[PDB]
């Protein structure tokens, strides 16, 4: 009994892992989201020239995108904004208040307008919600409401992947079908990661797709724990809900 | 069997402001950030890349700056409005050497190494980078380097946003090379200082003997006005398209 999404197609378009041959791996994250109600870009990687190149090689039509959502102000997620907005300025933007006011001003003058998200969760597009800005760095994740459950996407997940999972489940009172993105576990030891995994098991996370800054150790442990419920990420990966 | 040596000081230096939130010439899009195209006797380099690499390349075309004659790219510090144009510059002209502060992400340094002629990572010690061109070394909490150009008229010190304090960057430069400062230019980060401390900054720069200033970018209109009242013609107008000849 929800106003959920019919089909959701997520394409990783920038990553430091490669799911497909023919793509330059670089540090950063970005993914292209197509639903039956909206189309949007989530983050822009560290390099907008490679990002545009990746999208041409993936047959991603950037001009079909209605909105650009930014997770947090780090170089490896806003590094492609200028290249994206040059070719497709007619977009509404959704950014966290952690972003420089100078940048927010420049973006407003270039696009259909910038919505600034605060600590309060908020719907952005049909079936697409922001967690609100969390953590000291000031990061927002996006929650997509689908028939199979929630799909949560994070940039580097600085506030803690388990706090973002729990925030999303509170917002919409549905379980999480897919938790994906960068988890920022690359500097953590084995013990800590097993605690995170088992908290994600308590919350009932059904599938995960850790990539970007998640860490080789964490990704391996996630794989051995979730098995086939742990999806291979990287540039060119396509996930359909 | 003939020997060849670089000059210690450059006889002529030409500095072109190619990205700024002030405009000196008509018909350029101001945006928050800074970039400088520097031509010396023996080398040509970029100092920072603004916040928007597409606008940066457009500004450089309109200014008849050929990016491809630049031998090096120097980054002052990791803020979005100074590294925002790096990817656009390296796509058209990757055959450059890079000089970056150690406050840059090691992930970003790794990526820049694979795409360029190589990255030199500056630490806390001052360091020569090019003929007549030195870095102060990484200063401040954010980790910002400024460049000191050795000229036959004295030192030309260029700064991105000057987070460590413009008076400390001035003093460091003078310690480095034991020459007076002919020109101190760039963003001085004096935007939210009251007139009382802008005044003690100004007279510290007077005691250091700064001969000319060009505050721009994040300097602040309050400070810029006090600077232009104190220095008169020795305070130069900044902005896109401003060409300073030494
Ligand atoms: Mn991050
Ligand atoms: Mn990241
Ligand atoms: Mn700065
Ligand atoms: Mn700045």
Automatic annotation (TrEMBL), chain A:
Residues noted as binding Mn(2+) 2 in the record, renumbered to the chain: 76-77, 212
Source taxon at top rank: Bacteria
Entry annotated with the keyword Metal-binding: yes
Keywords of the record: Metal-binding
Binding positions for Mn(2+) 1 per the UniProt entry: 72, 74, 158
Disulphides: 156-213
Record's protein name: Uncharacterized protein
